[PDB]
Nucleic acid binder design. Sequence first.
RNA 1: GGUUCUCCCCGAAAGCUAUUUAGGUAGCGCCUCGUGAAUUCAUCUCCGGGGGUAGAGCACUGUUUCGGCAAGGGGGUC
Length: 72
Amino acid sequence: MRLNTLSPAEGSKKAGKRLGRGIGSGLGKTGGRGHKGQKSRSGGGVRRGFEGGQMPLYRRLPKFGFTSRKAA
RNA sequence: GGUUCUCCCCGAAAGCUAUUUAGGUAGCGCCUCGUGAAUUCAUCUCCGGGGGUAGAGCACUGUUUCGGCAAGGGGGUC
Ligand SMILES: [Mg+2]
Ligand SMILES: [Mg+2]
Ligand SMILES: [Mg+2]
Ligand SMILES: [Mg+2]
Ligand SMILES: [Mg+2]
Ligand SMILES: [Mg+2]
């Protein structure tokens, strides 16, 4: 038991993805984003619930019920 | 437009549906990793099924040529 002898348990520390650092890594160039499109752009991607322009599920279905206040 | 070290295993898609949508995006289809579950799945042989395509045919719906039998029209007589 010395400060240069302690070791973490196996599996506790995983490394972490580093994108854009060469071919050998497997995440070089595009960095896992594919080619072009909105999802490849910095800060790109659509908001939660967006399904294209199709009326989303949470707006296609009717609202129902009321909150009690006595239940609280 | 560009995205910087190495080796090992697996390995796509360019389709459908929707979209002020059409070089974008979403669910599903196809890839990967993990966990469960049954001869679960595939090939062949035998058995049980439903077809209406190829081909053919001309009863039907249409189309077509020749012959026979011929109403019945057209034209004169009146
Ligand atoms: Mg790759
Ligand atoms: Mg590019
Ligand atoms: Mg493209
Ligand atoms: Mg993309
Ligand atoms: Mg392979
Ligand atoms: Mg035929």
